[PDB]
Coordinates of N, CA, C and O in Angstrom, one line a residue:
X2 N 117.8 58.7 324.8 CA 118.2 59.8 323.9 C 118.6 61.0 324.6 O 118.0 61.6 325.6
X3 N 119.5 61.4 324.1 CA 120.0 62.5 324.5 C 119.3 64.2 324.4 O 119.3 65.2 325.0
X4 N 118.7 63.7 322.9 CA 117.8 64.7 322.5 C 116.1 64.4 323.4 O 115.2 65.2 323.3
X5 N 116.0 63.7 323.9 CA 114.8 63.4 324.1 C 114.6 64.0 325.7 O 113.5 64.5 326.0
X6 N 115.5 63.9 326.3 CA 115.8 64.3 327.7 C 115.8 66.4 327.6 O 115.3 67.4 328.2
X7 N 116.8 66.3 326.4 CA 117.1 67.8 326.8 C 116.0 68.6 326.3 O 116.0 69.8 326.3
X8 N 114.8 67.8 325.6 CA 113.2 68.6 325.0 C 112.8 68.3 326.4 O 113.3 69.1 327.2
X9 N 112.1 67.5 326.8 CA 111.9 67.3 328.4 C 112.3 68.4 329.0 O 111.7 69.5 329.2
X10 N 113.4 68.1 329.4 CA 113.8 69.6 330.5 C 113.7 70.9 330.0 O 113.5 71.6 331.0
X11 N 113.7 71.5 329.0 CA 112.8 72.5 328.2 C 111.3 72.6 328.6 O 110.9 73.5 329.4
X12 N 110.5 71.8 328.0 CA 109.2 71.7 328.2 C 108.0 71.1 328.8 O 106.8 71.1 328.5
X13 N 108.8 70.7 330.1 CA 108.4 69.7 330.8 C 107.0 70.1 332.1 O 106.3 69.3 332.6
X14 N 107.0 71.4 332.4 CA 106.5 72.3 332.8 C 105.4 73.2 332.2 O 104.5 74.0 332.7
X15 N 105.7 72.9 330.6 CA 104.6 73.7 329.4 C 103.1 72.8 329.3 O 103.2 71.6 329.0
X16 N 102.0 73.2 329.6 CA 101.2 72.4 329.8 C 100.6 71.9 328.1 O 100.0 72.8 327.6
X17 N 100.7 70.8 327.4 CA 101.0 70.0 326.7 C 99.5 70.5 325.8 O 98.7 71.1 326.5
X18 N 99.1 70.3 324.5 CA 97.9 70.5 323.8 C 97.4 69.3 323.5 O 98.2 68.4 323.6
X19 N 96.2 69.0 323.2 CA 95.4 68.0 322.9 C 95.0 68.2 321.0 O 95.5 67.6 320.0
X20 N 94.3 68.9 321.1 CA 93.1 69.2 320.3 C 93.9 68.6 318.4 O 95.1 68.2 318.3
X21 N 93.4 68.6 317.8 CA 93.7 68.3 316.0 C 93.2 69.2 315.5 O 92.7 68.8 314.5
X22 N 93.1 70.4 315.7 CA 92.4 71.4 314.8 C 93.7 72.5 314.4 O 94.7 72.7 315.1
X23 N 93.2 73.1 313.0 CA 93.3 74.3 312.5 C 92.7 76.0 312.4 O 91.7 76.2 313.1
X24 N 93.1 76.9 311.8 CA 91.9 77.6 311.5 C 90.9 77.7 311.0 O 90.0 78.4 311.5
X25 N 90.6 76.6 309.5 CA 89.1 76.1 309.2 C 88.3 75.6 310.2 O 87.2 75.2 309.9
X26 N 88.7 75.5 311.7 CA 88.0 73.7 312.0 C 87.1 74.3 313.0 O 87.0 73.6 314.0
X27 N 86.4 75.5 313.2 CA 85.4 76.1 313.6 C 85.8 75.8 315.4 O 86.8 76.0 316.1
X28 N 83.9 75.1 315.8 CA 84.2 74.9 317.5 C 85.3 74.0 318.3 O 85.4 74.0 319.5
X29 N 86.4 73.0 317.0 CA 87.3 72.8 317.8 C 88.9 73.1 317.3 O 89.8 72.2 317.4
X30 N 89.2 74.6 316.7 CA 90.0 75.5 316.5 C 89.7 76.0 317.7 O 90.5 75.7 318.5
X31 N 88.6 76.8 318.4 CA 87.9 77.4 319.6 C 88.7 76.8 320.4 O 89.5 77.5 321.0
X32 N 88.8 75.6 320.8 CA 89.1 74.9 321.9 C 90.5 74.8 321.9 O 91.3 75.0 322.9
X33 N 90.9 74.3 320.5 CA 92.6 74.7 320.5 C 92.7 75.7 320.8 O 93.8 75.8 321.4
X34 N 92.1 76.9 320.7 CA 92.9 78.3 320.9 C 92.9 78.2 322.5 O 93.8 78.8 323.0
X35 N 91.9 77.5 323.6 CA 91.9 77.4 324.5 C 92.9 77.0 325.1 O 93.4 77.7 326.0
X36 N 93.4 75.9 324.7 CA 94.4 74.9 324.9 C 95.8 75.6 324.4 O 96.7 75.3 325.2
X37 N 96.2 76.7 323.0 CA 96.8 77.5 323.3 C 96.9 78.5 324.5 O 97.7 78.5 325.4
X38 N 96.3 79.1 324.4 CA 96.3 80.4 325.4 C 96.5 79.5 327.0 O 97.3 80.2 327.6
X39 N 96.2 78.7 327.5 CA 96.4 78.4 328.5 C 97.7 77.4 328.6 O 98.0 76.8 329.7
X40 N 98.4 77.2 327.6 CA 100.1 76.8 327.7 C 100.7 78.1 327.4 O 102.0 78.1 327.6
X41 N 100.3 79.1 327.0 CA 100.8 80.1 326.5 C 101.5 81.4 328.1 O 102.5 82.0 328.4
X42 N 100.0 81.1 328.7 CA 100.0 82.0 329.7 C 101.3 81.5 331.0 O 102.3 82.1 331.5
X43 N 100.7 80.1 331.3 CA 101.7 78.7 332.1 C 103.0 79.3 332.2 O 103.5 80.0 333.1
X44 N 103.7 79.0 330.6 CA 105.0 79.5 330.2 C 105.4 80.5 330.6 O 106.4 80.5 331.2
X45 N 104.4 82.0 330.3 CA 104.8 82.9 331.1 C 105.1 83.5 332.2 O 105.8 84.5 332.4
X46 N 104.5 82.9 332.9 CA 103.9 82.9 334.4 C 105.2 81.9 334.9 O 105.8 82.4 335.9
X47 N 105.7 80.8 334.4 CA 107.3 80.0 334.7 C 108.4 81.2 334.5 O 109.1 81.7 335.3
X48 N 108.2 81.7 333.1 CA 109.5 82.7 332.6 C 109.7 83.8 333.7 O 110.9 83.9 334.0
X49 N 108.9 84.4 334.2 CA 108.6 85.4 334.9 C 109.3 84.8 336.9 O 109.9 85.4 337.8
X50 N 108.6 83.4 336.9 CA 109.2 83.1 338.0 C 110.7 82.8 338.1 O 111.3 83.0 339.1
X51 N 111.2 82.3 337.1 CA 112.7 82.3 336.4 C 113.6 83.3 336.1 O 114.8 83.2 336.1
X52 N 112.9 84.5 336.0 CA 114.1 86.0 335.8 C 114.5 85.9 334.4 O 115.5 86.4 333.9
X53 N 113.3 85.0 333.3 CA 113.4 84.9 331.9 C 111.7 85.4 331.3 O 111.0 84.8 330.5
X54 N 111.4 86.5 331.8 CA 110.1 86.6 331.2 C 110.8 87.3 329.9 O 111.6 88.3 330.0
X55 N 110.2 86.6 328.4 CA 111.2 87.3 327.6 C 110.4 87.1 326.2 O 110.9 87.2 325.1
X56 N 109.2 87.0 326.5 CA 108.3 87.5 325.4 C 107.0 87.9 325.6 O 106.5 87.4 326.6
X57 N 106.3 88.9 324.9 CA 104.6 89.2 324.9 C 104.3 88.2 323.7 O 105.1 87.6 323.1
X58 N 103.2 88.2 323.5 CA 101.9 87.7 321.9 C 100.6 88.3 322.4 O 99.8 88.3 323.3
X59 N 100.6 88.7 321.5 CA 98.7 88.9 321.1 C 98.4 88.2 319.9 O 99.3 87.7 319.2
X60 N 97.0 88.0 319.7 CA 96.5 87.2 318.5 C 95.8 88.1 317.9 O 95.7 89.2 318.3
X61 N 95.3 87.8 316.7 CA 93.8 88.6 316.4 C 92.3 87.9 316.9 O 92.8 87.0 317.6
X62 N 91.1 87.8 317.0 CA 90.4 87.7 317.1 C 90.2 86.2 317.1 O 89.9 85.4 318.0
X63 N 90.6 86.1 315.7 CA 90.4 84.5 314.8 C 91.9 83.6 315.7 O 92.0 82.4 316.1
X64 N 92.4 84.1 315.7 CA 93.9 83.3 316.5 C 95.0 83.5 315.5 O 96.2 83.4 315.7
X65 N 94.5 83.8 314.3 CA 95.3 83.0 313.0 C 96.6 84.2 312.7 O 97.4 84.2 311.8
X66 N 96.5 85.2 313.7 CA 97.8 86.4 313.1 C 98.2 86.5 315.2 O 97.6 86.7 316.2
X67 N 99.3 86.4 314.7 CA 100.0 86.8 316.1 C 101.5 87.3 316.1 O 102.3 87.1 315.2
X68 N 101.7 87.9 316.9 CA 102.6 89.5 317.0 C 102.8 89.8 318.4 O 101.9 89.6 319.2
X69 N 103.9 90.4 318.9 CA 104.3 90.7 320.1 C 105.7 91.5 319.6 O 106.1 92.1 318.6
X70 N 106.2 91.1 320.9 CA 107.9 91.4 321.6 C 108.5 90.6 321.7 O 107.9 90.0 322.6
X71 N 109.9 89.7 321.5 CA 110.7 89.3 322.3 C 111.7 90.0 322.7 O 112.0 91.0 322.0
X72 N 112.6 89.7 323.9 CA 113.9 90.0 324.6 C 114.8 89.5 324.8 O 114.8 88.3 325.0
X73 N 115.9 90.0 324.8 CA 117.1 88.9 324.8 C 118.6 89.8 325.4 O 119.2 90.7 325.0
X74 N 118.8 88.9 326.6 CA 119.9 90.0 327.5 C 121.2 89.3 327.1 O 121.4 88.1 326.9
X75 N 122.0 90.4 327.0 CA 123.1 89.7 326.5 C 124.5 91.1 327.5 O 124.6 92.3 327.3
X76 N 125.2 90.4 328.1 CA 125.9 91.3 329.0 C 125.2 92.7 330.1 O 125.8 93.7 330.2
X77 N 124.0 92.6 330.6 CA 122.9 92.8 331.0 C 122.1 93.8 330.3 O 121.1 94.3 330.7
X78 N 122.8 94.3 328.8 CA 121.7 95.1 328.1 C 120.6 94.0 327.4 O 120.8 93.0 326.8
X79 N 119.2 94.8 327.7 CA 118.1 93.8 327.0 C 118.0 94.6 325.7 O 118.1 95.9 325.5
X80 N 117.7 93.4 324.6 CA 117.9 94.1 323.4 C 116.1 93.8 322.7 O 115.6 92.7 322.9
X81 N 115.7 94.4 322.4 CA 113.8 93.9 321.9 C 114.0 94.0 320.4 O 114.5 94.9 319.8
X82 N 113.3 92.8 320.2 CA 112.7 92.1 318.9 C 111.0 92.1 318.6 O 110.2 91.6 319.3
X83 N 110.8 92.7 317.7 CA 109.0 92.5 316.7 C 109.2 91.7 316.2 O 110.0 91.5 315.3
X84 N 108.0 90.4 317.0 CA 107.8 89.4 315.9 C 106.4 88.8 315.5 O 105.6 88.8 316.4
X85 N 106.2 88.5 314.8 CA 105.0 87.8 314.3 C 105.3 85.9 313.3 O 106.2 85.3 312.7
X86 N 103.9 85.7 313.5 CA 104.1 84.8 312.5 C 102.1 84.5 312.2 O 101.2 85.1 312.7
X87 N 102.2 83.6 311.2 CA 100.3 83.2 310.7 C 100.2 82.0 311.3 O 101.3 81.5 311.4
X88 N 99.1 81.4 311.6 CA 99.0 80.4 311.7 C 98.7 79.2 310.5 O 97.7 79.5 309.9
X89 N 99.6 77.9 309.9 CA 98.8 77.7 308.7 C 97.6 76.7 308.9 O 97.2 76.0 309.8
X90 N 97.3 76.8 308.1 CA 95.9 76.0 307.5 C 96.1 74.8 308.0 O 95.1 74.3 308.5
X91 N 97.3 74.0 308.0 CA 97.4 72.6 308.3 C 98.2 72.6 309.9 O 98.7 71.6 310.4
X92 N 98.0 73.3 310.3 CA 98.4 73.5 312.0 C 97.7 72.1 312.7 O 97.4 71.4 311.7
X93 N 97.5 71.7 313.4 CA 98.9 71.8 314.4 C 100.0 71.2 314.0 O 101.2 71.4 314.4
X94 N 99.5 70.2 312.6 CA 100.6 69.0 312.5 C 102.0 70.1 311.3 O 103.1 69.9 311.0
X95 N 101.3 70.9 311.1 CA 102.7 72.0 310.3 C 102.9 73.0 311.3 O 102.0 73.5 311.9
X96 N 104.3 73.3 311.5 CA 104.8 74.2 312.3 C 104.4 75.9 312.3 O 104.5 76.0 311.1
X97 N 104.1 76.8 312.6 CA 104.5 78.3 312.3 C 105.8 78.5 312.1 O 106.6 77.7 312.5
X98 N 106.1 79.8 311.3 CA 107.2 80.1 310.6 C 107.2 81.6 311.3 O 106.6 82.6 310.9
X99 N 108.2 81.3 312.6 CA 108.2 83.0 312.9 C 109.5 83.8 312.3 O 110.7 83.6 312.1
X100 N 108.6 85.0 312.2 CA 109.2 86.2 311.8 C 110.0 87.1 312.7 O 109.7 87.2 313.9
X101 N 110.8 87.5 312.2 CA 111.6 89.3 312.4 C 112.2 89.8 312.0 O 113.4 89.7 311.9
X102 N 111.3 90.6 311.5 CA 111.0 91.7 309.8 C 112.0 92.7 310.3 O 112.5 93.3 309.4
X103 N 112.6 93.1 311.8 CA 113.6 94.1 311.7 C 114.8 93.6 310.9 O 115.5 94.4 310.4
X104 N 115.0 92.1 310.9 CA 116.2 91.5 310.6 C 116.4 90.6 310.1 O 117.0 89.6 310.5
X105 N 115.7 90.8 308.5 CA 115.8 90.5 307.0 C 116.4 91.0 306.7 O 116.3 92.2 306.7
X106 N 117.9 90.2 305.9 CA 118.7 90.6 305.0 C 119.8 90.5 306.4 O 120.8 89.9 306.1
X107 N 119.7 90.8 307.3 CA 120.6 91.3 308.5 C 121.8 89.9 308.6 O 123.0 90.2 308.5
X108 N 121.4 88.6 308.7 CA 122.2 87.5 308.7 C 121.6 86.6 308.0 O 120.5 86.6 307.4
X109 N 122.4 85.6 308.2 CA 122.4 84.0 307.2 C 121.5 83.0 307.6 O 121.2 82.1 306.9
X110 N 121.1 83.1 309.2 CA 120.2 82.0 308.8 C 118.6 82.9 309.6 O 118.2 83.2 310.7
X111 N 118.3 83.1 308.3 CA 117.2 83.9 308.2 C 117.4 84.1 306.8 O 118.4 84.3 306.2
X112 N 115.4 84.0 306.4 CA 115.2 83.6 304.7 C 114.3 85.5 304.1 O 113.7 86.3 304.7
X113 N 114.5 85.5 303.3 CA 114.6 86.6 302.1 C 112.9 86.6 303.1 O 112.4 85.6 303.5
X114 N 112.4 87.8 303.4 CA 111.3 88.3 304.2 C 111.6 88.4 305.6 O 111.2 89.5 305.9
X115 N 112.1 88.0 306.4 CA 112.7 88.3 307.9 C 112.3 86.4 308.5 O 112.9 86.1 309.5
X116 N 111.5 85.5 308.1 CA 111.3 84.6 308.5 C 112.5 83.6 309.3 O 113.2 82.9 308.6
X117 N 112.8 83.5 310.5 CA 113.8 83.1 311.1 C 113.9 81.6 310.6 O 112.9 81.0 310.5
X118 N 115.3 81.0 310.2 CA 116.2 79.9 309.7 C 116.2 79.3 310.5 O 115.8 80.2 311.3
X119 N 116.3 78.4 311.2 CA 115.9 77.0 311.8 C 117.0 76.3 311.8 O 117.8 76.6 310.9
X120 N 117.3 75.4 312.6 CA 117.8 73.8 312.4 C 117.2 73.0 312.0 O 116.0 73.0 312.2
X121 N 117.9 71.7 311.1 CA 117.3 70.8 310.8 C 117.0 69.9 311.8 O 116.8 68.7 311.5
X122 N 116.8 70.4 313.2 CA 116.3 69.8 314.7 C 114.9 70.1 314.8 O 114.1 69.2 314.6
X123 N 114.6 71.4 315.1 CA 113.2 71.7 315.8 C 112.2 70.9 314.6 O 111.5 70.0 315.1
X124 N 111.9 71.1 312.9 CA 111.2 70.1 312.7 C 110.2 69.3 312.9 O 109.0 69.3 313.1
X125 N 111.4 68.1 312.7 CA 111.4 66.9 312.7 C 110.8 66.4 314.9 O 110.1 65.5 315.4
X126 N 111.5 67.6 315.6 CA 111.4 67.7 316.7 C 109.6 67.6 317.2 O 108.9 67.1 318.0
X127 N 109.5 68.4 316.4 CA 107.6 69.1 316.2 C 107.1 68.5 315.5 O 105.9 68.7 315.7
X128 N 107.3 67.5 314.6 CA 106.5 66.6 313.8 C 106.5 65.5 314.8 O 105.4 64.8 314.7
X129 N 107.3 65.2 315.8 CA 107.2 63.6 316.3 C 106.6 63.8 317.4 O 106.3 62.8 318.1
X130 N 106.1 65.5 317.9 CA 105.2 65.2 318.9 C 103.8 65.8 319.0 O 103.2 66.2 320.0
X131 N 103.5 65.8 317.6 CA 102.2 66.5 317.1 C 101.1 65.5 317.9 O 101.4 64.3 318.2
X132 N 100.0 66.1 318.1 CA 99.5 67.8 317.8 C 100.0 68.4 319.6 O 99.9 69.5 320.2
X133 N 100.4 67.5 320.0 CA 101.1 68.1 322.3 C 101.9 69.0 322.1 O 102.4 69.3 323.2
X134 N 102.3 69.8 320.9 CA 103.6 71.2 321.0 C 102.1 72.1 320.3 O 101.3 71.9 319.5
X135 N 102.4 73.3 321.2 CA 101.8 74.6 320.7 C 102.8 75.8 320.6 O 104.0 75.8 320.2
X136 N 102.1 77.0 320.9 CA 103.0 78.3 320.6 C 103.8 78.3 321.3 O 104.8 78.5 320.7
X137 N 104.0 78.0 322.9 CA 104.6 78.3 324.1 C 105.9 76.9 323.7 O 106.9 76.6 324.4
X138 N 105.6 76.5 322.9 CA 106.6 75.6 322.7 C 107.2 75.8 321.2 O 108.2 75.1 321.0
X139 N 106.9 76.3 320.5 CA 107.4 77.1 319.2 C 108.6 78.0 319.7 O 109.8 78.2 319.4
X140 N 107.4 78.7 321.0 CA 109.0 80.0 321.0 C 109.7 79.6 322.1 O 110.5 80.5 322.6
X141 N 109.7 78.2 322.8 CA 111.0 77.5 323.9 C 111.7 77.2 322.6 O 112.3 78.1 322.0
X142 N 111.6 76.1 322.0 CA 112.6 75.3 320.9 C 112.5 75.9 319.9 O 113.3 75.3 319.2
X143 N 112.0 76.7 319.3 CA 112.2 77.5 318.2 C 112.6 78.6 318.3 O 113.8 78.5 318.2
X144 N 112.3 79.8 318.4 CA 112.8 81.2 318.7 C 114.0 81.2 319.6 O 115.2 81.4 319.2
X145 N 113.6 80.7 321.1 CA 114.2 80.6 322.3 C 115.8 80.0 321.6 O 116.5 81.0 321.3
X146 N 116.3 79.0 321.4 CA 117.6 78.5 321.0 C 118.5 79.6 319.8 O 119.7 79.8 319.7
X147 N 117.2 80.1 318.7 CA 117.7 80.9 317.6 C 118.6 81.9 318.3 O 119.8 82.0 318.1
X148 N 117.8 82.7 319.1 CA 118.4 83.7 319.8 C 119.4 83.8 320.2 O 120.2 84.7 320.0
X149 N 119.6 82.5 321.2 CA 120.8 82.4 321.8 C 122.2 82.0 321.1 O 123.4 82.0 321.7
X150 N 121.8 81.7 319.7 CA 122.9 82.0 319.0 C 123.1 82.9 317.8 O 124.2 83.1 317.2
X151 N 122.0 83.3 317.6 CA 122.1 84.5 316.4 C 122.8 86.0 317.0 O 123.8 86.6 316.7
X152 N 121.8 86.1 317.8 CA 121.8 87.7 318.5 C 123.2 88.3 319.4 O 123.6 89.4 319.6
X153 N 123.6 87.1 319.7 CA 125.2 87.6 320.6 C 126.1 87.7 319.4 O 127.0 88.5 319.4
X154 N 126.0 86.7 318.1 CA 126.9 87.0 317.2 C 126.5 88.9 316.4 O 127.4 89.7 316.3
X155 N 125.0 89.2 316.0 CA 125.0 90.2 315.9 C 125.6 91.5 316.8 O 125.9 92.5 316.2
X156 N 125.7 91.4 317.9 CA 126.3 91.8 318.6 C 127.8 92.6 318.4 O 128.2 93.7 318.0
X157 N 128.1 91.5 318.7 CA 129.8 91.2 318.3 C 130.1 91.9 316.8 O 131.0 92.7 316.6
X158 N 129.4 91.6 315.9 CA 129.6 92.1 314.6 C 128.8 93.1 314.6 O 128.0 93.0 313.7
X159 N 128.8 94.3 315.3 CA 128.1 95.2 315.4 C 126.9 95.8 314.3 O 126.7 97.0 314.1
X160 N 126.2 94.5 313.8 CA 124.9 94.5 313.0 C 124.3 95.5 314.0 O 124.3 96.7 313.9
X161 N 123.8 94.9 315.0 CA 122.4 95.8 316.1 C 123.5 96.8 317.2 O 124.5 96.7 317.8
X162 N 122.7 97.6 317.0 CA 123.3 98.6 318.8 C 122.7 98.8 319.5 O 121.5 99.0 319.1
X163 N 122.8 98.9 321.2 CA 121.7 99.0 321.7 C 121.7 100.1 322.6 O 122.7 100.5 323.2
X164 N 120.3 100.9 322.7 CA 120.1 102.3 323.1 C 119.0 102.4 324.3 O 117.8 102.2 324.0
X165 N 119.4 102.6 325.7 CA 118.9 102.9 326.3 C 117.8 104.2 326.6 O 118.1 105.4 326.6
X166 N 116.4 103.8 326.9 CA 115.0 104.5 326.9 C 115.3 105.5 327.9 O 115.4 106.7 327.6
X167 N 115.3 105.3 328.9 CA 115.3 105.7 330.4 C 113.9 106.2 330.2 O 113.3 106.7 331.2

């Protein structure tokens, strides 16, 4: 498979999840969150050695609300995105639905609240390899691909502008 190879070389380096739990499922949600946060960090710590370190997350307490930054360079301006998403109830085998509330309403594939639009790929992609995909693999094949084709078009169609902090 053609698709099977190019998830591989994506993720192949993301250290893989075990666990069957949600947020009801007490001391082995705990352990998933374990099993999150340490594919979570992995990822980072690759992105960073790559010259793609190109997101933060924090959680809340419980795991179940998470929020950060993403980044995205496009002609070497970096442009930053607020995102969040919940975790649901039926996790791991149901996906998260991430957000960016700056840019609701802003384009088309993105749904009435800022919730980012998808392919009918990632899915079905994340259902066939439940419960081994976590966060760090949400935002490779999910976020990560959106970007690269949403945000250069906003660009171009001068939706977003970008302003330098110094």
């Amino acid at each position: 498979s053609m698709a099977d190879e190019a998830t591989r070389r994506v993720v192949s380096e993301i250290p893989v999840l075990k666990t069957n739990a949600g947020p009801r499922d007490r001391e082995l949600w705990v352990q998933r969150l374990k099993e999150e946060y340490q594919s979570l960090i992995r990822y980072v710590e690759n992105n960073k050695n790559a010259d793609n370190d190109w997101f933060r997350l924090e959680s809340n307490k419980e795991g179940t609300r998470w929020f950060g930054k993403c980044w995205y360079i496009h002609d070497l301006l970096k442009y930053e995105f607020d995102i969040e998403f919940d975790i649901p109830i039926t996790y791991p085998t149901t996906a998260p639905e991430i957000a960016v509330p700056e840019l609701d309403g802003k384009l088309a594939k993105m749904y009435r609240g800022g919730k980012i639009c998808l392919t009918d790929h990632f899915k079905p992609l994340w259902a066939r390899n439940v419960p081994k995909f976590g966060l760090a693999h949400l935002m490779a094949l999910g976020l990560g691909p959106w970007l690269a084709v949403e945000i250069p078009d906003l660009i171009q169609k001068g939706v977003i502008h970008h302003k330098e902090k110094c």
